[PDB]
């Protein structure tokens, strides 16, 4: 999409990530796991629900069929002209308001992902390289405590910086 | 290196076959969606506030109020939640002539 | 029939919370707004890509 992450530089989704819309897959010595980014999923959920509510909260109140005699053909045509006139407006509004917001929502999600990936890249700097498909290979040893530190955004950068310097120089 | 542990960033996928239209694209499969459009009915006329409609049947407003003899099922009518004319509603004025401002009367009666 | 509804149209009763219906323009009670569409579905989730 617009931010080239979803169906973009991250080629596919994770059917194995039940807990949220965006998150992390880790691999260390201890094993493999998934984890949702609770905070950004939450921001998204709130954003999207609010969007949905606005489109709907707007719409409100109005049809009460009328009759006319054989000498009232002009006011009858006007009544129909009115009824059809509003019906097309309201139909157009609705259909197009939905086409527009769908486009925007899929881009929103796309942005959220790109932004999540960038938040990590930002923390890790040169302590890990980018190996594509939204993956970060660590120059150092990252246990379960170190992974959690990435996901809650409180990763201690210099802590592992010295161990990571000496690994880029050689292997 | 040496272990080269990996973290990756990704998104939800599921076995949803719900599809939406965007402006740039049609039939996009999405993980979740909301239907905004009701298209089901129960094919019957029902009560409102627990009061049955008035079924004029073969009669029409005119035959009803005037008391066309085909409308005797209507003689005891007193309350209703709305009025139904069927597309068989032919019995109106039996002796022929103009019902003056009839359309206006219909309007008055619809409240 | 002896059913109850909060919204009635000449084709039948509607028993629903949605903002729109395409059943009939004429309604009695509390009804969704009539439109001519056959589809108004709003994305909430993301593009669903279950694999490579």
């Amino acid at each position, epitope marked *: 999409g617009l931010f080239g992450a979803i169906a973009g530089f991250i080629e596919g989704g994770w059917t194995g990530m039940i*807990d*949220g*819309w965006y998150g992390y897959h880790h691999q260390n010595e201890q094993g493999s796991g998934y984890a*949702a980014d*609770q905070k950004s*999923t*939450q921001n998204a*959920i709130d954003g999207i*629900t609010n969007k*949905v*509510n606005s489109v*709907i*909260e707007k719409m409100n109140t109005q049809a009460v069929g009328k009759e006319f005699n054989n000498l009232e053909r002009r006011i009858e045509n006007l009544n129909k002209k009115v009824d059809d006139g509003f019906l097309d407006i309201w139909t157009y509004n609705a259909e197009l308001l939905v086409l527009l917001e769908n486009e925007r929502t899929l881009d929103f999600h796309d942005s959220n992902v790109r932004n999540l990936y960038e938040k990590v890249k930002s923390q890790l700097k040169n302590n890990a390289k980018e190996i594509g498909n939204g993956c970060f290979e660590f120059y150092h040893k990252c246990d379960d405590a170190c992974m959690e530190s990435v996901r809650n955004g409180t990763y201690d950068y210099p802590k592992y910086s010295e161990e990571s310097k000496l690994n880029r120089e050689e292997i | 290196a040496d272990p080269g542990d990996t973290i990756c960033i990704g998104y939800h996928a599921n076995n949803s076959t719900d599809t939406v239209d965007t402006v740039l694209e049609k039939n996009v499969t999405v993980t*979740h969606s*909301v239907n905004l459009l*009701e298209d089901s009915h129960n094919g019957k006329l029902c009560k409102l506030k627990g009061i049955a409609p008035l079924q004029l049947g073969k009669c029409n407003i005119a035959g009803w109020l005037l008391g066309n003899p085909e409308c005797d099922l209507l003689l005891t009518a007193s309350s209703w939640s709305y009025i139904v004319e069927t597309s068989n509603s032919e019995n109106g004025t039996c002796y022929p002539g103009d019902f003056i401002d009839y359309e206006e009367l219909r309007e008055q009666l619809s409240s | 029939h002896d059913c109850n509804t909060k919204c009635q149209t000449p084709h039948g009763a509607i*028993n*629903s*919370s*949605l*903002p729109f219906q395409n059943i009939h323009p004429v309604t009695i009670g509390e009804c969704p707004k009539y439109v001519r569409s056959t589809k108004l579905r709003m994305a*909430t*989730g993301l593009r669903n890509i279950p694999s490579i």
Partner: antibody
Amino acid sequence: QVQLVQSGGGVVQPGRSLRLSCAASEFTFRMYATHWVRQAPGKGLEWVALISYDGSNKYYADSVKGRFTISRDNSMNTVYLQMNTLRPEDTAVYYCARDLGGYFIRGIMDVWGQGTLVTVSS
Amino acid sequence: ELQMTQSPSSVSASVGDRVTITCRASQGISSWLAWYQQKPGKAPKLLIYAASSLQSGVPSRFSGSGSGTDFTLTISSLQPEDFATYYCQQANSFPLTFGGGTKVEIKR
């Protein structure tokens, strides 16, 4: 924003059954899970049950389980708590609360109903 | 059999006072703990979830902290509208569990 209007409180006899309602004023409700919580007179809050946004699942306390069934009617935008083997210790005011996350259950209750009193006694 | 305990059962305080309530869980529940406020005869309000995240409506007077087994809610400067009962609640596992409540009362 969301008002949850609760319905179906009442006086009932132990053994005999009762059904509770939680109807949301706002369309988006059908995207959230729903909790039921209760409060015995003068007492603390006790979690009772949850149902996800589809009805997919579906969770209960131990205090009650195999006596209460939670269900959901997303088209009518309402949620139901069916209570069968009622017992004097189930007397309480009952609250439904919307979940903070659902589509993703988070187990926290962010919008509450007014609460509905149920009295189990003979 | 998760058991949430709240301490103390009451506190009396002047408006302006810093009140601090604790809540202890019988086993480790990570940081998945929420605080609610309930005035009598009304529904509870959410204040804090995930140990320390403030919920959007809530004045920042409110502040949660803790991890694993021990948790505290702190009201920095009790306002008149803060006299009510406060319940903690674990969101680690089902069934969900409420502490037993801490009433905070005016001190005249």
